[PDB]
């Protein structure tokens with residue numbers, strides 16, 4: 432809708448409860464890089480996000 | 481006059497239950513078969529809910 436996130440009406444649905452037997456103190460996210468096919472004369476490596 | 485006496489209550493003469501039939505497809509056979517576990521020192525937490 433017009434608002435990106437403040438307005439909404441639903442609920443979050445649980446799926447499965449799982450254990451993790453190790454101490455956790457830090458978290459980090461990942462990302463995916465699409466390989467870019469460049470001309471041989473460029474001689475460089477590039478990615479598109 | 482009216483005198484109140486011991487209350488009248490009918491006990492249920494039946495007790496029969498209808499349980500689920502298939503659902504989760506053999507809780508112990510998908511990963512442990514009938515009886516097959518790991519070594520002693522591997523006290524892995526494996527609970528099925």
Ligand SMILES: *[C@@H]1O[C@H](CO)[C@@H](O)[C@H](O)[C@H]1NC(C)=O
Nearest residue numbers: 508509510512513514515516
């Ligand atoms: C699972 O156990 C049964 C008997 O308990 C036997 O067929 C075998 O050990 C296991 N099944 C398979 C397909 O290996």
